[PDB]
Every structure is written in structure tokens, then in C-alpha cells.
Amino acid sequence: VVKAAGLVIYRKLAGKIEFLLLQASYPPHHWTPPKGHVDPGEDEWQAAIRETKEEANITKEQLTIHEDCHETLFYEAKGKPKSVKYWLAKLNNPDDVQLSHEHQNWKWCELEDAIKIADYAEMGSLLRKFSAFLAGF
Template identity: 70%
Template sequence: MSTVVRAAGLVVFRRVLDRVEFLLLQASYPPFHWTPPKGHVDPGEDEWVAALRETKEEAGISQECLKFYEDCHETLRYEVRCALSMFLFLLSRS
């Protein structure tokens, strides 16, 4: 397996009274799972820029509406359709 798919996204949350709510979007393809806004890193783009772009495209939330926790991030690696996917998730608050 030599193909590696790079992707990035934001885990967006907000506090509402005594609760914490997370932004999850439902996939448009089966099994219609729920996921944070994320997507592929385009050529010449870094993960940070890709995460911001995907969040704006998928959820309509721009960088100016978010607070970022730069020290809080996680990279997940798993296989999808015979390719290794590497997702970098960054934490942000709306």
C-alpha cells in the first residue's frame, strides 16, 4: 500500500449553558455517518489551510468565527479502500 491520502479537519465545539455541543455533518453517501468538517489536503496546501477551507466549504464557518487551540490536535491513520488515510484534526471553539 503506497498511496497515502492526506486530509485535515476541525473539531468545532461550543458551550451552551452547562453542555458542550460539537459540530458534526452527515455524510452524503452510505452509511451516512456523522463526522467533523474535513477533507483532502490539496497540492501545495498545508493541513491548517485545508482544515479552514473545508470547514468554510462544508459548514459555512469562517476562521474569524473560531478560536483555535493550537496545542490540541490528533492525527488518525487508517485504511480506506486500499489506501492509507492520514487525518489531522485540530480543536476550535465557535
């Protein structure tokens, strides 16, 4: 299995939870939170943080990462199984997202909209789980 990781970044805007999604610049132009392959020497944690910095220009210092809220998605990518481990992370301040060549747009999305845009059933279930976690947090 090809291993990847990322961070489900959220913010609270005027009391409302919103999740950050990024639109790939390459077809199928799907939307996911910042995430990427585990690179040599890294574990999932390191990869999730680095990919977040690379893809959205959000640093570890700008985030409160909830270590007790993580989930791993499994799906076929490039004819092979791929795992993507995500941790939930709060963007504390009104920092500005900036993209790299890997993405062409972004959106801050309320739960239902995020699920619709992310489109994949398993990602949807993950977002619901993470939303439920914040409700009890």
C-alpha cells in the same frame, strides 16, 4: 498515505460542551466533524480551515482554534491509508451551520452522544482527549 485534515468544532451551550458532526450525503452516511483532503499547495492547517468553511459555512474568524490541541487519525479509505489531522476549535458565537452537497444533516452533540454517532473507536478516543483538554484549558 492520503492526507486530510479538519476541525473538531465545539460550542458551549448554557455551560455544556457540544461537538459539531456532519452526516455524509453519500453512503455509508457516516458522521465526522468538518474535514477533507489536503488540496494542491496546501498543508493540513489550510485544508482544515478551508474544508470547515466549505462543509459547515464556518469561517476562520468565527473560530478560536486551539493550536496546542491536535491529533491525527489513521484509517483505510479507498483501499489505502489515509491520515486525518484535527485541531480543536471553539465556535465563539451562535453562528448557523449550512451544508454543502457533501453532507445531508448535522447535529450538535454532547461527548457521549458524539462518540456513539461518530462510531469509530479512534474518533471516540480523540473526542475524549479533546474533551479532557477543555477540562484543563
